[PDB]
Amino acid sequence: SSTISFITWNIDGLDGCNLPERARGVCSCLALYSPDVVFLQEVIPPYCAYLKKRAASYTIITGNEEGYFTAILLKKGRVKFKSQEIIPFPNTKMMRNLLCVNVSLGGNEFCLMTSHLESTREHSAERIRQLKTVLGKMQEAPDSTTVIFAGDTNLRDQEVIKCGGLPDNVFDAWEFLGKPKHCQYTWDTKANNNLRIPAAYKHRFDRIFFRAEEGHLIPQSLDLVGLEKLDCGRFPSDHWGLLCTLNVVL
Amino acid sequence: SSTISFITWNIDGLDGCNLPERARGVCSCLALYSPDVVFLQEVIPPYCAYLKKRAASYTIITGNEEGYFTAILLKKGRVKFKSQEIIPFPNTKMMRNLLCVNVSLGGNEFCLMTSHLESTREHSAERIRQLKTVLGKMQEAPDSTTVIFAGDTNLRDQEVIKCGGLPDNVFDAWEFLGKPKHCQYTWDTKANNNLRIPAAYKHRFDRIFFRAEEGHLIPQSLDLVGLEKLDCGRFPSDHWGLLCTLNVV
DNA sequence: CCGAATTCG
DNA sequence: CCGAATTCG
Ligand SMILES: [Cl-]
Question: Which residues are listed under the site Interaction with 5' end of substrate DNA (chain B)?
Answer without folding.
Answer: 68, 187, 205, 239
